[PDB]
Symmetry: D3
Subunit: 322 residues, 6 copies
């Protein structure tokens, strides 16, 4: 029992994609556990422990694909679970949760600035960069490159069905960056004039595969075809612990109405099924580098990032369950 | 100088894409010349000849890329010009136009049917077929395969920006064919479950390359990647004769507002440019077969088709020129 | 309805693969039509017609995959048919069938010796050559080159399940050509030391694909991987005219007992299915040349062989049909 | 110089392949070292040392290719050696050897059951899986996934020349897993209908190459061609430490009579050589993952498995050497 | 007996490469037979027939690789041989040779202008074109493109060992074309900034392979890697008749001193062999188009150019031999 | 301010390529700092420190691309700076420099030897090896393989523009190794007869890419094309640490006159530009192994080498900076 408004409203805003982008989802989730601990009227520590377990279950059960979300939850609740089981009283527990979530948030913010600085060294003056969807990590790189006086242009793919490309196009243009907007279908047509591709990630697997917005794997295919470097800009908390032990990342199937509006789809024949995967999977061979906040790695070093940050927790249960 | 309303109206409708599809555009243009000839008020054959040349020009200057259009005009106008030059009187010239236009129309209808009968033999029971845009020729293949009692399913790509996949989805469904509808970005994600690709063509070049709806070349790339047969259904008048002598096909750049609607687009800053190519070009190494009315060829035999039907004409100027 | 025993024996020996290899099968079918003509006890020219038609159907319904068989029955029966339809009397029909047979049979022998001569020029002193199955056309190339005193070695893949590779190993060893015999699985391992690959063909399609003994496509694939020339030695009567009109070649599935002897298989459980495809299909992009009796072609010129020698016959029914 | 008969029997049964498969061979060598320790009649701790050293050399000189065998002898003898060199007395050495054996033997069994559990997560309901040879690690993956109630089918390649594929077909059929049995040559033909490929390993090198039964590289190659995941199921003790210092793995060449029975071969001429390589080598770029008991790695992380578990031992001589 | 100075001096100037480039060699050879017929002091036709046979033998036996040479010789001597065997008297024979050689020369000149016009349509404004060696055909294309006001730049590879790149670089610069000169080794480094590759040919095979200056096949390899169109500019008389019947083109091995000067090479150890192939062979898959004077073909249509111009003469002896 | 003549002279000789090869340049730079420290007239440690910083800068500003140079300077200067900052007196600082420089030199000599011992194990009896430029590390491999009695032959590419293959040819010949010497353009022509490629490195990046003599990347491309192992012999100090944080390696553009001599070049028009990159970059997918002093790695493990030796240093400024 007993969860605050902010937890529920955040969960609904993740589901509906009013809060979106794997990094932002992650911070939002940490932010929500932070408000539950702030506002909780719990008296006992075991009461609050149980509230935070249940806030965490609600937040995890929103969108499955970007592992940034459970890694945020984990980051807070490994520390909440240790404090609680160590024998922390109420206010010690409240501070552990509140602070762990402030920690993760700040670190996510810092990781992205840093990804931008690292990645922008791989951008050269005159570069035409093609991007996909709307990824804060990818945009940090492009923004920094432009602030360094590299005269760049970005090809923004519209990113059907949900139009994330429109966000990207206005954001980059607002920083002063020349933009070329095209449909997703025009990616091979314009790969010849493209020098660099920069995209984000929702989950990165142990073998180096990249799960990112539907279409990503196509752009990467034709980038390889043309020898255009595919650079994936991605925080360490995009990497997927459980792929270490064989798990496949779930691909989120979103509502048909995102593709065909309700007003039109109801008029269509029964024998047409609309299928709307929100993500696809790009194989490591088509990735040049993964730019984390810890540096440039080849895609196959994803196992090392995981071995050293996340491996230890795979013998344990999730820090929010019974 | 004295041009019937039908010529102008056909022209407006081709430009606007109310009349669309390479094959249909070509028939509409014959038809238009047919009608100018039926309804001409001319008294001398010279006067009719002039109206036909001028109508031909109007029709040519509508859409560049689908060569079926100029080939239709040529079919009619080579015959009209040979009659005029050979001394024909007003009524014999009228008839040569009228009857030439009809022969093209009739031949076009028969060729789409025959293509269906031929391509269908390459479709097998249980096949999943992916297609792109709305191609009458490709549909004839799927439609016939289904009528032969092969249980097929078609993956239809929505085809941005103009949404031609909607036409295709609803049309195939009307015949009883199950459809799976997806965004263009999802073609690689679903290539693994696809057994055949079947698309159409606006122009085929001397070396075997296929100009078709923007996005076609991406679908073929990932099809090759996966060893899925790419079959292009396409009539002999889709073959481009000026490429035998080095010409490159012009790619139509259509209005930004087809991508981002007018309302929205004017709210955007200058430094975003919307680019809307209506076609791309697929190399012959990514085509398994071209299915024409005369049979199955590898794409490299495009030169043979062009030699034995269109080559004779490239010593002469255009049959509508002064 | 009065069919000589030789036709029945021939059909049965084609079925059991006692008579095997695509060219030899073809010659044996012509041979049977020849003996049916010779030994007939037909009063009328219509009684002979009817026997030949019936013998043809029996012979056609033995093994489907190697088009050689029907191209031979065609060669005879096109001529027998045209004779009977110009009102030929009896012994004029009998001789037509007898002399169409001999003519095809002799032209087969000449085409194979000529393929040798043309093919051997692409073999170079020292060459190591890998082959597959037992192909008399492939063997002619290898034998002639050794006769030219080029020092060659042949890698012979054993060719499961029916062990054709043993026939080849002994045949070549009998001309004094050193043989290296290996399992099929070992083709990649030895492809590094291989200089040329030379195989036969059962059917060759209009886009250049080559249907040949199960395994052939695997050898071709790793040959391409290593840039080893794949050379296909194939008479004109291996080219498959029905593929010009969209047809797909059928892949013979032979008895599971060829893989697991009947004694052993009956002891195995029901939930193991044994599948025994006798042919597979190699794409044209992995074939460097086809060596015919008319010359060397790229695989994609199969359509020209077909056009110029068989394309006429497709607009009519099979010559042995009613 | 006093070696118990069990060691000699074990060596001979490893040579004749009555005991086969890389993990089982390893366990049988540890088992033999264990029985030599148990049954020894050695007075001194140096007489036991000397017997174990000698037993080790005998066991090492049976089959070279599967590094499992020496990694097992190492595991025991590193510990037996360190004991004897710290002045251990007799029954302390005997127990060390006895308990190093049991410990390796049990850890082998656990690694294989864990590889099952990790591997099965990458199999999906409906999957068709191709394998090669008979690998207990590969089989554990397949068996566990069927135990999870995923409906799978396994394509089993017969694996010439020694027919290991028969052992696999019966083993899987015995757990109620539908089997499709085919010749090795047919792997490309059925790769289109295959969803996952799962094979074992005899040795795995420092750059990620996988040495496994002859044919394995061919399956991997056409799997890559078709974008079918190739998954290698391999205990840590299959990784080859000497490859870290440049060594190449030796490929066992076994008796020509395994290919052609002795009866038939003696009738064949001298100028046919029969070559029988028992393994081949697959490059890492064709391997999607290696499934170890410690997790899922990209093939290129083989060097980290080696570094962290064996790199120490390379600076000394083999533990059984003088 | 009895050959003029000009025949011998031309033969020596071909050998020494003072006359070079396959087209020019060809015209020079025709020019030489033309002077032998002009200046011959022969009295009988059979005398002159025999002089021209022997002039032709001397000219053929200079450099083997560019088939332009024997096709020039053939073009003259098919016509000389027919006139002579038809019963032509002296002056009829003299005129046949003189005129046939003037014919070939003029046609070669016209073919190159025409290749330039055709090819230049495939060059687009702003194009950076990479070329290799010095090819008149290739230079016609580039020159014409520049005369059309297309603002181009050419990357000229120096073309070791004989520095033909220096000729190319000065010739293009003298017409006004901006040039970038690089070593052969820098071709991949600069393929990313390259839009089009244009090279010539010495011989083109029946299957579409292109034999051209050593290095050509490398540039073509990396052009394919990057999707840069490889366009081969080549007269019909570059196509190689005898590859129709299996012949491999001979690759000319030129003197070691061209690579290492005599003054230096004499000082080098015996165990160093210098190898100097003057040409290599590019496979058809890396060629986009062959631009002949008859139009754009795919590389695989080389067989058609040969079938229709040269096929007929392969049943005959060379028109200069006994 | 007070710099010994040896520092300046070393600097001139590095720029001029009298001292050349990445490994030798690095030793020459340690050596130079060694000598400045031996011969300094300084009295305070501060004065010596300043001379060492200034000499370091002079040495750094010679050639950019081979990172071995800056790594050598760092090895010395990290140790010198830690001593200076930790309060060391004049003589203890002198000694730290002198002895640090010697340790680098000695370690470099030992590492080349060890690389040879390791790489040689990957060379097999009868191997043909192609190499490029003059690499001490690669030569150590070939030299050792030969000394082990493997009959090898080396194809040496001349390496324009500076002709480094001459050095390599004569050096390998001096050991008794047969050499085949070729122009760079001939690498694809001779790749079919090559068994191994063995080249060196100037810099290796975090993602595994190899910067080496211009032309290296072409040889590796066609090697991959042909399944010939590309082995890069290269010391740990060839690994580039600034690439871990996104830096791209600068490619040295050297003087036009190295390509075209001064005499000739001034006779050329303005509108020719000579471009002379001394390096190109080879992607990691085209490298089989890197052979370092610590063993064989796949190229993607470049990050591991960089992490465990150089990563610590990238929080600090350069140890020669103020
Ligand atoms: N759902 C998933 N979860 C994790 N990895 C995946 C998933 N789907 C595909 N992959 C991996 O991503 C790549 C897909 O390659 P392909 O199937 O060849 O497109 C491979 O490296 C797979 O291991
Ligand atoms: N000397 C030659 N004469 C004719 N064709 C050749 C010759 N050498 C190679 N080829 C062809 O050129 C291409 C060479 O491809 P590869 O050997 O894979 O480089 C193939 O299409 C061969 O048929
Ligand atoms: O795939 C998406 C968006 O998914 P959605 O819009 O469906 O959330 C983004 O590229 C990543 O999540 C990374 O973005 P960031 O770098 O901003 O985390
Ligand atoms: O596939 C086979 C034989 O199959 P099978 O044994 O099943 O008939 C041979 O490669 C071809 O028939 C060609 O042989 P030839 O060149 O002798 O026509
Ligand atoms: O290979 C060369 C030169 O060989 P070389 O210099 O050894 O004669 C040229 O590219 C062709 O011969 C075609 O040139 P063109 O188009 O001028 O015929
Ligand atoms: K590009
Ligand atoms: K598929
Ligand atoms: K080979
Ligand atoms: K598949
Ligand atoms: K380019
Ligand atoms: K090779």
């Amino acid at each position: 029992a007993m969860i605050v408004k902010e937890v529920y409203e955040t969960a609904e805003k993740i589901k509906s994609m009013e809060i979106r982008g794997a990094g932002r989802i992650a911070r939002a989730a940490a932010q929500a556990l932070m408000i539950q601990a702030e506002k909780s009227k719990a008296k006992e520590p075991e009461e609050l422990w149980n509230e935070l377990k249940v806030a965490s279950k609600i937040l995890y059960n929103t969108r499955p694909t970007a592992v940034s979300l459970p890694n945020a939850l984990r980051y807070v609740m490994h520390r909440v679970k240790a404090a609680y089981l160590g024998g922390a009283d109420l206010e010690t527990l409240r501070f552990t949760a509140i602070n762990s979530a402030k920690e993760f948030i700040y670190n996510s913010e810092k990781a992205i600035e840093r990804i931008g600085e690292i990645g922008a060294k791989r951008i050269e003056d005159g570069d035409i960069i093609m991007t996909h969807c709307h990824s804060k990590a990818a945009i940090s790189v492009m923004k920094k490159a432009f602030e360094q006086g590299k005269n760049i242009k970005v090809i923004v793919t519209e990113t059907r069905p949900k139009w994330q490309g429109k966000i990207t196009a206005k954001e980059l243009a607002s920083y002063g960056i020349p933009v070329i907007y095209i449909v997703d279908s025009a990616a091979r047509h314009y790969m010849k004039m493209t020098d660099k591709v920069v995209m984000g990630a929702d989950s990165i697997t142990a073998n180096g595969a990249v799960i990112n917005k539907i279409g990503t794997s196509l752009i990467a295919l034709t980038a390889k075809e043309h020898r255009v470097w595919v650079m994936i800009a991605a925080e360490t908390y995009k990497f997927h612990p459980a792929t270490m032990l064989g798990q496949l990342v779930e691909i989120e199937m979103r509502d048909p109405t995102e593709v065909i509006p309700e007003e039109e789809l109801r008029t269509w024949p029964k024998n047409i099924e609309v299928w709307n995967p929100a993500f696809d999977v790009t194989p490591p061979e088509y990735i040049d580098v993964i730019i984390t906040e810890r540096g440039i790695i080849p895609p196959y070093a994803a196992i090392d990032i995981l071995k050293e940050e996340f491996g230890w927790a795979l013998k344990y249960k999730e820090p929010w369950e019974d």
